[PDB]
C-alpha cells in the first residue's frame, strides 16, 4: 500500500536522487486540492447503501436470469454474497480515492479476483456490469453541490471513474 505521495518517493529512490523543485510543486497542488478530495470520499461513503442497493436493483432488472431459480444470485445466501461483493469493491475504490493511487485496490481486492470467479463459476461479465452501475451512481453523487462550495472538481471525478474502470476490467 502506497499513496500518491509515496509513489513519487518510491520512484525517486530507485534513481537515488532528491525530489526536484517541480516535483515538490506538483505535490503542493495535491495538498491544495485536499479538501475537495475529502468531499468526494465523504459523499460516496455517506451514501454507501444507496449506491449498492439501487445498482443491484438495476442489475436484476436488466439481467433477470441471475435471480431465476437455479441462477447465480438465487437463494438468500447467494443474494447476500452478491451484495457483499458490490460493497467490497466500493470500499476499496473509496480507499484508492483518498490515497490517490490504486495500490490498495489491486494488492488486496483485485489480486486474484478473476480466477476466484472462474473456479466458482460466477459470471465475471455481470460483475463488471454491476461495477459500472455503481460508478455512475457515484460520479452523479460526486458533482452535486449540496453542502459544498461551488468550484471545479472535474479532474477528481475523472480519477474516481478511473478506479471504477480499473476494477471492472480486472474482473473479467
Amino acid at each position: 500500500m502506497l499513496d500518491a505521495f509515496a509513489k513519487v518517493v518510491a520512484q525517486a529512490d530507485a534513481r537515488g536522487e532528491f525530489l526536484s523543485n517541480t516535483q515538490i510543486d506538483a505535490l503542493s497542488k495535491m495538498v491544495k486540492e485536499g479538501n475537495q478530495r475529502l468531499d468526494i470520499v465523504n459523499k460516496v461513503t455517506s451514501n454507501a447503501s444507496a449506491i449498492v442497493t439501487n445498482s443491484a436493483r438495476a442489475l436484476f432488472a436488466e439481467q433477470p436470469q441471475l435471480i431465476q431459480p437455479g441462477g447465480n444470485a438465487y437463494t438468500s445466501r447467494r443474494m447476500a454474497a452478491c451484495l457483499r461483493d458490490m460493497e467490497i469493491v466500493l470500499r476499496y475504490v473509496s480507499y484508492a480515492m483518498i490515497a490517490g493511487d490504486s495500490s490498495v485496490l489491486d494488492d488486496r481486492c483485485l489480486n486474484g479476483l478473476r480466477e476466484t470467479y472462474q473456479a466458482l463459476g460466477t459470471p465475471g461479465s455481470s460483475v463488471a456490469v454491476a461495477i459500472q452501475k455503481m460508478k455512475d451512481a457515484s460520479v452523479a453523487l460526486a458533482n452535486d453541490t449540496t453542502g459544498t462550495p461551488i468550484g471545479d472538481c472535474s479532474s477528481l471525478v475523472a480519477e474516481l471513474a478511473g478506479y471504477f474502470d480499473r476494477a471492472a476490467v480486472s474482473v473479467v
Binding site: Q63, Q65, P123, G124, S125, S126, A128, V129, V172
Partner: protein
C-alpha cells in the same frame, strides 16, 4: 468458408507474395483474442437452450404472432422457431471462433430472406428475436466477448433484412 487465418492467407496468396509484416500483424491480432473466443464459445454451448428461451420470452413470446393468426401459432410453427433460432445462435458461434463472417452468408444468409418471403415469415420479428438473442449473449460471455459474438448477430440481421 474462411477463418481469419484463411482470409489472411488468401489475400496474401492472391497477390502471390509472402506473409509480410502487415499480414502477420493481423494474424497476431487474431491469436491474441484466441483465448477469448473459446471461452465465449464455451458458455454459449452450455446455455444454448437457456439463451433461446430467454430471447423468445423477451422479444416475441406474447405478441400476436404467438396468438392465432400470427406467424408462429401452431405447435409445428412454434417448434420451427426455436429450431430456427438455434441456427442463428449456433452459426454466430462459428463466426465468433473463425473470426470471419464468411460462413454465415455461405450457409445461412444466401436464400434466407428469399425463403422467409416464400413462407411468409415476418423478417421484422425475426431480427428483433436475434437482437434480443444478441442482448442475452452479451450477458453470458461478458462485454468484449459480447462485442465479438454481437458483431456477427447484426451481420445476420443486416443481410437478412
Amino acid at each position: 468458408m474462411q477463418d481469419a487465418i484463411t482470409s489472411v492467407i488468401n489475400a496474401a496468396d492472391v497477390q502471390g507474395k509472402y506473409l509480410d509484416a502487415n499480414s502477420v500483424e493481423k494474424l497476431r491480432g487474431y491469436f491474441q483474442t484466441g483465448e477469448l473466443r473459446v471461452r465465449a464459445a464455451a458458455t454459449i454451448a452450455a446455455n444454448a437452450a437457456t439463451i433461446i428461451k430467454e430471447a423468445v420470452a423477451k422479444s416475441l413470446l406474447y405478441s400476436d404472432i404467438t396468438r392465432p393468426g400470427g406467424n408462429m401459432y401452431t405447435t409445428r410453427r412454434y417448434a420451427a422457431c426455436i429450431r430456427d433460432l438455434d441456427y442463428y445462435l449456433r452459426y454466430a458461434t462459428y463466426g465468433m471462433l473463425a473470426g470471419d463472417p464468411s460462413i454465415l452468408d455461405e450457409r445461412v444468409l444466401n436464400g434466407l430472406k428469399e425463403t422467409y418471403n416464400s413462407l411468409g415469415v415476418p423478417i421484422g420479428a425475426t431480427i428483433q428475436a436475434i437482437q434480443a438473442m444478441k442482448e442475452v449473449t452479451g450477458s453470458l460471455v461478458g462485454s468484449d466477448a459480447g462485442k465479438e459474438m454481437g458483431l456477427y448477430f447484426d451481420y445476420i440481421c443486416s443481410g437478412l433484412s
